[PDB]
RNA sequence: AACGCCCCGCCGGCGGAUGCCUCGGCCCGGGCGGCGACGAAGAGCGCGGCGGAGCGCGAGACGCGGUGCGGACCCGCCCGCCCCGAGAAGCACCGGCCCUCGAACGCAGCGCGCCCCGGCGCCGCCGCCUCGGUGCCCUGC
């Protein structure tokens, strides 16, 4: 149950916020769970999805694995190579089938200096959280 | 007869009710209470690579600069970016640019002056400079 009176629980307001979010909020809302092996390596659960990493689709009619080749931020959809609509002819450029990030698992992440710094920033902040509860 | 017209059992039109759904309205509470001659509110006309309306902006024009945060895209076609910082989208604050009308300020509204050096509106308060008066006096003549 919510106790913060400054946060709205109105359906109309929540949906309006969802449909008119700015760029960074949209990016954060497009996260996927990390695999068990990646969870052990970095002590985090989810990661914003980015072009260049590998995912596994675990639900829907287009299950599979592939590399992320495009992010459509104003639809909340991604295109992964090899997941296409069935073609009318064998000679036509494939049409990707857009997929929501919340039904895939990240298998391997494309690594940057900025990604490293962001992950390290994340870990050092839930370390305080864990130190402040339990143990 | 037959056709035409009017009434059942299937299939088509025309029209847009109904049902379900809605980033919209309306009411109640809380906060705030901040414009302008340092040129406001409002109006006009312009500004995009391919650009009509709307938003935004002002010849530095569909934006420029600084400081922080952010971290891969940029609705089409293009161009660009890609990196342990090398920087796309976004966000906050600060500094500037700011055409013509408008309280609207050389006159007038699209034309024309004065001036000598650059500048030339009104009203008020304070102060200064230059002056007037058979006002009240005084001196000299
Ligand atoms: Mg236009
Ligand atoms: Mg004028
Ligand atoms: Mg005038």
């Amino acid at each position: 149950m919510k106790l913060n009176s400054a946060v709205t629980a109105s359906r109309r307001k929540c949906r309006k916020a969802y449909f008119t979010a700015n760029a960074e909020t949209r990016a954060k809302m497009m996260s996927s769970r990390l695999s068990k092996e990646l969870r052990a390596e970095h002590k985090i659960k989810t990661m914003p999805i980015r072009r260049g990493d590998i995912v596994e689709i675990f639900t829907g009619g287009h299950k599979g694995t592939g590399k992320v080749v495009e992010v459509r931020r104003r639809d909340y959809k991604i295109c992964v190579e090899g997941i296409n609509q069935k073609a009318r002819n064998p000679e036509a450029k494939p049409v990707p089938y857009p997929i929501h990030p919340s039904n895939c698992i990240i298998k391997e992440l494309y690594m940057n200096g900025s990604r490293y710094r962001a992950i390290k920033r994340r870990q050092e902040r839930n370390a305080e959280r864990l130190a402040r509860i339990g143990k």
Side-chain angles (χ1 to χ4, degrees), chain A residues 1-108 110-135:
Chain A
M1 175 69 226
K2 179 170 70 46
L3 295 168
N4 188 15
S5 93
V7 178
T8 194
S10 185
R11 165 153 176 109
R12 178 179 162 190
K13 291 211 175 85
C14 295
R15 279 169 60 82
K16 177 131 188 264
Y18 169 81
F19 280 121
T20 81
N22 58 43
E24 338 179 10
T25 324
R26 280 178 125 84
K28 171 72 169 175
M29 286 155 62
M30 323 199 36
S31 312
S32 327
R33 165 157 288 173
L34 297 176
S35 77
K36 274 134 181 113
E37 325 80 271
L38 258 44
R39 288 266 282 278
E41 194 185 21
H42 331 108
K43 275 66 49 202
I44 50 177
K45 196 206 267 196
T46 62
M47 255 307 255
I49 198 90
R50 175 224 207 284
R51 191 206 341 149
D53 39 56
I54 317 300
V55 297
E56 168 222 293
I57 317 301
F58 69 85
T59 186
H62 282 99
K63 310 209 209 106
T65 300
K67 185 225 301 304
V68 178
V69 292
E70 175 140 8
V71 180
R72 270 131 84 157
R73 264 155 180 217
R74 75 179 65 215
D75 290 277
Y76 300 100
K77 290 297 187 35
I78 56 161
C79 311
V80 1
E81 97 203 315
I83 309 299
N84 315 298
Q85 315 249 34
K86 115 148 156 219
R88 297 179 168 270
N89 314 122
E91 59 214 19
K93 156 166 35 62
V95 192
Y97 179 80
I99 280 152
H100 199 270
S102 73
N103 34 43
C104 18
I105 291 144
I106 307 174
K107 285 329 201 37
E108 172 221 80
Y110 164 101
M111 257 316 183
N112 228 335
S114 274
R115 274 210 131 170
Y116 282 129
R117 301 200 292 279
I119 275 163
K120 175 262 306 143
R121 195 175 71 231
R122 265 277 275 288
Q123 314 164 357
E124 73 77 8
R125 257 192 281 232
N126 36 16
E128 309 154 64
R129 196 205 155 72
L130 305 182
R132 175 184 64 82
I133 66 181
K135 322 294 199 191

